[PDB]
Write a new protein. Sequence first.
Lengths: 42, 47, 151
Amino acid sequence: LAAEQEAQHIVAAARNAKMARLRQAKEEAEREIAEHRAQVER
Amino acid sequence: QMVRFIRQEAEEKANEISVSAEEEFNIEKLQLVEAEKKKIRQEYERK
Amino acid sequence: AVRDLSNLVKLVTLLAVVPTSYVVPRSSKLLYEDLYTVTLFGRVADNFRIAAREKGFQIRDFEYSSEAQESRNQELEKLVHDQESLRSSLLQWCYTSYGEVFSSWMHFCAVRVFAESILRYGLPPSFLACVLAPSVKGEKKVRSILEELCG
């Protein structure tokens, strides 16, 4: 049924949520370090 | 009928979960910047 | 009404509707026959309700799981074992108790007869009585014989 496929897509997006949070955390650490470096360099 | 409506509801749930993925990425982006001010305050001018 | 899980068909539920078209895959027939099944599917609750209890035939209640039916069968075997115990081994124990009670009643009757003899004769233990089960005319003949010593 189409309901099963839509539920599979929902599960995939739910996993992608946890994946994207962790992926963005590391990159945002770079932004935080950049703000700290600007404050220091001033 | 009921099967199609359930499929539409689960598709809406998938869209909501993807929106939550984007929101969590942006939330990490904002939260890493957040609370840095106190760390710089104790690290930079306190030193 | 009861213990219908033993005849279960194991999307479908234990209904056994005794005296359906939808987008859901109703093209199915459950094996819940001892009763009969109807075209239904779990994708739509409306179809299952219509095929089980919405109208016409009523859904028969069943034990929650087929494991409940198996446990009921095992408990039935254990109950039959206990009843057979009470009817054979406990019956033999009851027969032994009945024999012991008959022996005790005979001993008590002998003691009573000894007391009656001591009342009607010398105090030291001495009896010459007899015990039997004759007819009424037999009791009359016994009374005629023993009218010498009657109570």
